[PDB]
C-alpha cells in the first residue's frame, strides 16, 4: 500500500503510527499511514455513531433539567454553564469599555508567550496555496480549546490534550476535509462536527454546553489575530508538555501557529467570525442526528440501527419520566 501523508499541508508521515506504540489514545484511525482523506471522513462518521451513547446523553439532560441539588453538585453542569474562561473575560472586559468595538482587541504578549514564539515554533517561511482547510482547522481547534477551558474551569489537567484532541477531527482523525466526496457549508459542517463530538466523547455531554463553547469561539475570532495567537500558544503548550501527545504539535500545531503568526489575515479572521456565527445561529437540536443501535439480531448478530436527533431522545426520555412520576409503580 502507498503511504498517505497527513498533518499540516499533508507534509507528514510515520510519526502517528510510532506514537500509537507509546500510548497515543487520541488517535482514532485504525491505519493512519494508509488511509486517504475521504476514507478518514468515512471512518470518523462510522466511529462517531458507534461512540455516541444515547442513554448517557439522556441521563445528562435529565440531571440538568430535573436533578435535585445533590445530583447537580456531583454532576457539575450548572457550575460549568456559569464559567467564563480567562481569554473570553479579557475580550468581554475590553469590549464593554471600547469606544469602537468593531475594531480589533489590543494585545501585549507576555514574556512567556514571547519566549514560546522564539524557542518553540519553527522559523521557516510559508508558501501554502490551500489556506481554507487551515482556517477551518483554527476554528475546530479553538472549539476544542474553549470546551476544555470551560470543562476544567480554567485549570489544565493531565488529560487536557486528550479532551482537545478528541473534539478536534483534524487531530483524532487527521481529517481536514470534514465532508465526504459523493466555504460556508464547510464552516457549518465544522460546527455540527464539534457539537456531535462534544456530545459523544467528553465527561459532560450537553448541547447547551457545546453551543456555549461555539459562542466563545466567535468572541475569540472577533478579538482578532493576536487574541487567536494567545489561544494557539496555550493549545501548543498543552500538547508540547505531554510526553506522548506532542506528536500533534510536530505534525500540525507547530506549523499552524507559525504559519498563522506570519501569514494569518485580520480580514479573513473577521469574515470567519461573522460566517461561523451566522451558521451557528441557523442550527437547532434537529440538525444533530445519530444512528443508534435499537437491538441486535439474536440469530445474526447484526445490530439493528435507528436514526434519532437529540431532541427526539429528550422527548422520549421526558415521556418515560412523566409515566414513572404521574403513575404509581
Amino acid at each position: 500500500i502507498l503511504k498517505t501523508k497527513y498533518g499540516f499541508d499533508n507534509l507528514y508521515d510515520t510519526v502517528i503510527s510510532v506514537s500509537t506504540s507509546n500510548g497515543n489514545d487520541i488517535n482514532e484511525l485504525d491505519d493512519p499511514e494508509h488511509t486517504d482523506a475521504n476514507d478518514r471522513v468515512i471512518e470518523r462518521l462510522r466511529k462517531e455513531n458507534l461512540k455516541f451513547d444515547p442513554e448517557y446523553y439522556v441521563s445528562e439532560y435529565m440531571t440538568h433539567k430535573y436533578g435535585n441539588e445533590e445530583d447537580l453538585e456531583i454532576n457539575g453542569i450548572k457550575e460549568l454553564l456559569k464559567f467564563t474562561p480567562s481569554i473570553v473575560k479579557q475580550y468581554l472586559q475590553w469590549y464593554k469599555d471600547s469606544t469602537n468595538p468593531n475594531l480589533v482587541m489590543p494585545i501585549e504578549f507576555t514574556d512567556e508567550e514571547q519566549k514560546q514564539m522564539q524557542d518553540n515554533l519553527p522559523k521557516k517561511s510559508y508558501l501554502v496555496e490551500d489556506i481554507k482547510p487551515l482556517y477551518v482547522t483554527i476554528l475546530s481547534v479553538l472549539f476544542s480549546y474553549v470546551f476544555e477551558q470551560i470543562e476544567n474551569e480554567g485549570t489544565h489537567t493531565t488529560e487536557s490534550a486528550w479532551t482537545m484532541g478528541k473534539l478536534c477531527p483534524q487531530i483524532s482523525f487527521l481529517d481536514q476535509q470534514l465532508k465526504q466526496v459523493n466555504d460556508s457549508s464547510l464552516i457549518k459542517i465544522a460546527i455540527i462536527t464539534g457539537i456531535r463530538r462534544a456530545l459523544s466523547y467528553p465527561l459532560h455531554r450537553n448541547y447547551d454546553l457545546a453551543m456555549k463553547a461555539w459562542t466563545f469561539v466567535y468572541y475569540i475570532l472577533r478579538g482578532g489575530k493576536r487574541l487567536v495567537i494567545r489561544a494557539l500558544l496555550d493549545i501548543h503548550e498543552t500538547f508540547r508538555f505531554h510526553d506522548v501527545y506532542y506528536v500533534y504539535d510536530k505534525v500540525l500545531l507547530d506549523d499552524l501557529t507559525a504559519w498563522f503568526i506570519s501569514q494569518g489575515s485580520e480580514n479573513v479572521i473577521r469574515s470567519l467570525a461573522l460566517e461561523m456565527r451566522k451558521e451557528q445561529e441557523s442550527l437547532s437540536k434537529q440538525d444533530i442526528e445519530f444512528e443508534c443501535i435499537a437491538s441486535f439480531n439474536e440469530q445474526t448478530g447484526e445490530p439493528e440501527w435507528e436514526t434519532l436527533n437529540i431532541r427526539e431522545m429528550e422527548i422520549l426520555a421526558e415521556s418515560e419520566y412523566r409515566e414513572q412520576q404521574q403513575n404509581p409503580q
Binding site: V58, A294, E306
Partner: protein, 157 residues
C-alpha cells in the same frame, strides 16, 4: 536522540558493560503486553481514597475529586502525598496527589480532595446510566404502533 519510547528517555544515563557492544521492530501498547496476573500489588504501597460510584467516571477523565465524591479515606494522608483512588469493588481508578490532609477529609463539607496524576481506569466503565427504557428501542416500538408523525419522527405531545 529526539525519538525514544517513554521508558527509554535519558538514554545517555544508561551505562554499558566493558567488552562487546551489541547496538540497540516496534513495541506494543501496555494493555497489549501486560500480564493477566495480580498486578494491582504494584499499588499496595500508596495510601487509599475510596470514590463514590457517581464520581468514578470524572476521575477516569482526569477531573479533580471533590468532597461529594469521597466515601472512605486512609489515616496518615498528608497534603501533596501521592495516593491511589479506588472503587468500592477494589478497582484502581487513578494515581493522584492529595489536596487535603486526613483532618480536613474528616471535617470539610466542600473542596478538592485530590487532583489526578495518572489515570489507570478506562473512561466510561462507570458511565451515566438511564434508569428507564432505552430511547432507540422506544422509537422502534412507536414506528411499529404508528405513534410517529408523517416525517417519521417523535413529535412534541
Amino acid at each position: 536522540t529526539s525519538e525514544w519510547p517513554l521508558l527509554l528517555k535519558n538514554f545517555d544515563k544508561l551505562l554499558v558493560r566493558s567488552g562487546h557492544y551489541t547496538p540497540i521492530p516496534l513495541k506494543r501498547d501496555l494493555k497489549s503486553y501486560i500480564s493477566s496476573g495480580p498486578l494491582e500489588t504494584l499499588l499496595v504501597g500508596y495510601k487509599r481514597i475510596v470514590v463514590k460510584d457517581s464520581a468514578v467516571n470524572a476521575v477516569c477523565y482526569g477531573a479533580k475529586l471533590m468532597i461529594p465524591g469521597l466515601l472512605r479515606y486512609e489515616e496518615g494522608i498528608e497534603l501533596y502525598d501521592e495516593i491511589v483512588l479506588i472503587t468500592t469493588k477494589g478497582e484502581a481508578i487513578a494515581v493522584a496527589i492529595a489536596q487535603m490532609s486526613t483532618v480536613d477529609l474528616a471535617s470539610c463539607d466542600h473542596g478538592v480532595v485530590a487532583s489526578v496524576k495518572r489515570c489507570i481506569m478506562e473512561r466510561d466503565l462507570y458511565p451515566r446510566r438511564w434508569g428507564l427504557g432505552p430511547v432507540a428501542q422506544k422509537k422502534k416500538q412507536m414506528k411499529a404502533d404508528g405513534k410517529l408523525d408523517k416525517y417519521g419522527r417523535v413529535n412534541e405531545n
